[PDB]
Amino acid sequence: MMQISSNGITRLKREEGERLKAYSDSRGIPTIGVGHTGKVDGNSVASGMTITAEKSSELLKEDLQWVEDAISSLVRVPLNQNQYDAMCSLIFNIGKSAFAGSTVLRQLNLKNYQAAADAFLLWKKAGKDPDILLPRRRRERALFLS
């Protein structure tokens, strides 16, 4: 079945940021790679853990299973690989419940692909800045339409 591509992983890494040495996120959660909070090689992520870029990518591919599963369960129209990779990036950011209720999903399921692409641009607010995610949304939209 369809899964994120290597291009999709590179682009997502470059939107999210990669950190190959464990750190504490802004809430206090030990994290490594691209948002990996679970174990690595059977150990809890903790200060002192390092990983390779290969490991970071393989951890991300596994952590995306909920995203891929959301696409499979909710999306009822065909997606090309660029569309799929762009959707993975959006959903990994905004989360499953936000995606489930989104205009992106509604439009895609109507086979209104251009309108679905445009509706990425709605997911632009974070905190006190109403458009800080808009550049990322524009890049994802461009990937979708590629």
* Binding positions for a second copy, rule: CB under 8 A: 24-30, 37-39, 43-46, 93-95, 97-98, 100-102, 123-127, 132-133
51 touching Cl ion, by CB under 5 A: yes
CB 80 to a second copy: min, Å: 25
CA dist., res. 33 & res. 17, Å (int): 8
Assign 21 to helix, strand or coil.
strand
Nearer CB in complex with a second copy: 16/118: 16
Q: How big is the site for Mg ion, counted in residues (CB under 5 A)?
A: 2
Contacting residue, 69, 95, 100, 129, with Mg ion by CB under 5 A? 69
Catalytic residue among 16, 18, 58, 63: 16
Q: Which of 57, 56, 36, 53 is nearest to 45 (CA)?
A: 36
Residue 7: name the closest of 138, 116, 136, 146 by CA.
Answer: 146
Based on the residue annotation, tell me whether 25 is a catalytic residue of this protein: yes
Are 88 and 71 a contacting pair, CB within 8 Å?
yes
Task: List, by residue number, the catalytic residues.
Answer: 16, 25
